[PDB]
Amino acid sequence: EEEDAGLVAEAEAVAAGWMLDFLCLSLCRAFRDGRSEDFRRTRNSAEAIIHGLSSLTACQLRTIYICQFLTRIAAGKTLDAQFENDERITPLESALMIWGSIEKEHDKLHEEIQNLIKIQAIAVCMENGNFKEAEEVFERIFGMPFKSKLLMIISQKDTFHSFFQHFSYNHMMEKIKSYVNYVLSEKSTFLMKAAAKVVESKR
Amino acid sequence: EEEDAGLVAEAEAVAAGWMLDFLCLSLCRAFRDGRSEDFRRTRNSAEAIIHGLSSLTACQLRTIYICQFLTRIAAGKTLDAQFENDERITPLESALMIWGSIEKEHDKLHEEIQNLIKIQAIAVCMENGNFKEAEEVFERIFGMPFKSKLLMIISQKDTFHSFFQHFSYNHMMEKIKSYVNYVLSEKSTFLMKAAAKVVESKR
Ligand SMILES: O=C1CC(I)=CC=N1
Ligand SMILES: O=C1CC(I)=CC=N1
DSSP states (O other), X not given: OTHHHHHHHHHHHHHHHHHHHHHHHHHHHHHHHTOHHHHHHHHHHHHHHHHXXXXXXXXXXXXXXXXXHHHHHHTTTOTTOOOSSSTTOOHHHHHHHHXXXXXXXXOXXXXXXXXXXXXXXXXXXXXXXXXXXXXXXXXHHOXXOXXXXXXXXXXXXXXXXXXHHHTOHHXXXXXXXXXXHHHHHOXOOHHHHHHHHHHHHTO | OTHHHHHHHHXXXXXXXXXXXXXXXXXXXXXXXXXXXHHHHHHHHHHHHXXXXXXXXXXXXXXXXXXXXXXXXXXXTOTTOOOSSSTTOOHHHHHHHHHTTSSSOOOHHHHHHHHHHHHHHHHHHHHTTOHHHHHHHHHHHOXXOTHHHHHHHHHHTOSSOSHHHHTOHHHHHHHHHHHHHHHHHOXOOHHHHHHHHHHHHTO
């Protein structure tokens, strides 16, 4: 009699884990394709779904970290976004902490993305005339060896500087898109594959 | 090449329709069992999922109406909730408009629920000392024949009145729970049934 409710709660948990995996994947494809409004709406759906879940596997937790990293990278130019209890931590600094803490291989693409997020954390502060904030951000990032170049640019206050062109926001975005592309190849969820069978069935 | 994106968007739409049906059903069971926080969290999930959808069948739309009716009934004692553009419309009046407009059979249980929502729309106004609001609500509902009894109670200002005991809030709630019980028997969604196979598989 009482085990009937336990049965239902258990099925709701399996189904919610599947919805989480579907939404995490769909958030990755939206970011990769640059569908900004879709990324926003799928983030809202993943957030509500997470509040409905009580248990999580290490793979679901890792996925949640990757999606949090993507949400923060998307808000990297929005210096008004606060993702942590410490209000001084800019959105690109918050993406960088997740990136350097995810259980993933530290390959050359990983290092490249990290160094690009670092330069851009300082660059968006200089881009909005917040020269003192760029210095504060730089202190929390240095506490890579190219810090001598960054510190020299913060003091000079040169906004449209040549260094920020080579290591551009677009370059950081493109290197991150390559990573998202790679993980998706890896990922094939129960939900995506079943719905894709219904689509091929109607062809 | 371009049809590959169309394929993905189509599968995301099928998968989102399945998530909607799962969440609508789970909202119904939470209401029926009186799991209030679960109802709140599942409502938030269904809302976000709906904002991600662009097409809907008449069956999905009807389900959305039933769930909106349940959300408003849950807030029937919350006279501070505004569900429509007209701010004067109390939550129980908003549930009553959906109830009398859903494409469903108008059986004796339907009529009973409607008449119980009507009495309670006036009763929660008298319960909070808003005697003029009960009169205003009564004007928009009458503009059953028992209106002579209701109007006589509004004028007298008798809060803990005998009429409201027979046609109690608990009675309205219980008659609505019977209805929710009945529709669930009807109810088998793709998501609930697949997750329930995984649960039986682990037994
Ligand atoms: O809390 C979260 C979860 C996910 I998935 C994305 C963003 N924030
Ligand atoms: O807009 C909505 C949808 C649903 I399902 C429940 C409540 N509000």
